[PDB]
Swiss-Prot record, chains A, B:
It comes from Homo sapiens (Human). The gene is FLT1. It is linked to Can contribute to cancer cell survival, proliferation, migration, and invasion, and tumor angiogenesis and metastasis. May contribute to cancer pathogenesis by promoting inflammatory responses and recruitment of tumor-infiltrating macrophages. Abnormally high expression of soluble isoforms (isoform 2, isoform 3 or isoform 4) may be a cause of preeclampsia. Glycans are attached at residues 32, 64. N-glycosylated. Ubiquitinated after VEGFA-mediated autophosphorylation, leading to proteolytic degradation. Detected in normal lung, but also in placenta, liver, kidney, heart and brain tissues. Specifically expressed in most of the vascular endothelial cells, and also expressed in peripheral blood monocytes. Isoform 2 is strongly expressed in placenta. Isoform 3 is expressed in corneal epithelial cells (at protein level). Isoform 3 is expressed in vascular smooth muscle cells (VSMC). Interacts with VEGFA, VEGFB and PGF. Monomer in the absence of bound VEGFA, VEGFB or PGF. Homodimer in the presence of bound VEGFA, VEGFB and PGF. Can also form a heterodimer with KDR. Interacts (when tyrosine phosphorylated) with CBL, CRK, GRB2, NCK1, PIK3R1, PLCG, PSEN1 and PTPN11. Probably also interacts with PTPRB. Interacts with RACK1. Identified in a complex with CBL and CD2AP. Induction: Up-regulated in coculture of VSMC/endothelial cell (EC) or by direct exposure to VEGF of VSMC monoculture. Up-regulated from the second trimester of pregnancy to the term and in the placenta of women with preeclampsia (PE). Up-regulated in monocytes exposed to bacterial lipopolysaccharide (LPS). Coiled coil: none annotated. Disulfide bonds join 26-75. Tyrosine-protein kinase that acts as a cell-surface receptor for VEGFA, VEGFB and PGF, and plays an essential role in the development of embryonic vasculature, the regulation of angiogenesis, cell survival, cell migration, macrophage function, chemotaxis, and cancer cell invasion. Acts as a positive regulator of postnatal retinal hyaloid vessel regression. May play an essential role as a negative regulator of embryonic angiogenesis by inhibiting excessive proliferation of endothelial cells. Can promote endothelial cell proliferation, survival and angiogenesis in adulthood. Belongs to the protein kinase superfamily. Tyr protein kinase family. CSF-1/PDGF receptor subfamily. This is Vascular endothelial growth factor receptor 1.
From Swiss-Prot, chain C:
Disulfide bonds join 14-56, 45-90, 49-92. Antiparallel homodimer; disulfide-linked. Also found as heterodimer with VEGFA/VEGF. Isoform PlGF-3 is found both as homodimer and as monomer. The lineage of its organism: Eukaryota, Metazoa, Chordata, Craniata, Vertebrata. N-glycosylated. This is Placenta growth factor. While the three isoforms are present in most placental tissues, PlGF-2 is specific to early (8 week) placenta and only PlGF-1 is found in the colon and mammary carcinomas. It is found in: Secreted. Glycans are attached at residue 63. It comes from Homo sapiens (Human). Belongs to the PDGF/VEGF growth factor family. The chain holds residues 39 to 131 of 221 of the full protein. Isoform PlGF-2 contains a basic insert which acts as a cell retention signal. Growth factor active in angiogenesis and endothelial cell growth, stimulating their proliferation and migration. It binds to the receptor FLT1/VEGFR-1. Isoform PlGF-2 binds NRP1/neuropilin-1 and NRP2/neuropilin-2 in a heparin-dependent manner. Also promotes cell tumor growth. It comes from the Eukaryota.
Amino acid sequence: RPFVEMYSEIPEIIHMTEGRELVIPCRVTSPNITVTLKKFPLDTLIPDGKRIIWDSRKGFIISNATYKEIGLLTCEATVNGHLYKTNYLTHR
Amino acid sequence: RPFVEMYSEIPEIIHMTEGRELVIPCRVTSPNITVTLKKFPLDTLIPDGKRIIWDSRKGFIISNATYKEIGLLTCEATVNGHLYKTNYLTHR
Amino acid sequence: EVVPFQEVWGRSYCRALERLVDVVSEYPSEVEHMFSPSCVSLLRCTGCCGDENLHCVPVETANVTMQLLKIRSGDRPSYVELTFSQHVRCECRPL
Amino acid sequence: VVPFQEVWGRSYCRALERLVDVVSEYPSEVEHMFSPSCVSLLRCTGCCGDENLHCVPVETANVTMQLLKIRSGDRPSYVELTFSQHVRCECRPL
């Protein structure tokens, strides 16, 4: 298991506001583990290195949360032939 | 083909009046063919001999039309293993 | 290509269709609280019935149980399971 | 029990069948009565996870349907009516 917080089908509720920083706290165990950030239904937020920074010790940090970040988000990673997910719900 | 007047795709329109006679005119070539009156989606109108009469040269004769007989009606017959259909649309 | 007439007729006649109903309207004693999502999809009878003086009404119902999140002012949030009544079979009746 | 993610997916933002009046797509047809008088169209609907967003079409397409026009006293007609379907939806600020 890569995520520190054990999984639930049931998302963890994160409160956010437009404008202020947003942390998807999906921390992990090794720096060399690839984690996809998905937002329902079909968006992938790709780490670019300035608005979407991927920190292996914090999760994903988002500066300037627009409306496009409100909803059900999932962190995904595949380790040893198995797909792992952690769910979050953003609520303004 | 057992019916005299083919209505396979587009139904013939029959004007009906609340409480008066309503003929579904699906007359047939030989008096020996069994014909079934259906009303979409699920109804089947069996000729009981008085309220609903089957007359092979006329069609189905319904003596006191109610709101239950408004809509899409279908006469069905099977000849030599083939199902044939004629559709009527009753309107008030 | 062109949707055939009977398919057109059948799809709008009298049918149970999904529509969004909001949870607090199903559970008015819960107004002070918030649910996520705030609306849920239920089967409801809908249709034109072939006649301007008929309407499509439920003739049969059934319960569905749904998993939701309840957000509370001052308290911890909770996983919750709520039941709602769906329309399962519909038929045409007079106004 | 419908699992949460299905509950979510079912109400969030999507192109959903609803019944729409013909006269609401063809309002110049006042005099008459189409049969059927309403048709099934895909329409964007949802709670969008926020009561300050709403679910709007982002991609659409045309469908054509066979309908009938039962007339005042002229005679009945066949007609092929085009409508616009919602193919994709998204949540946008009100």
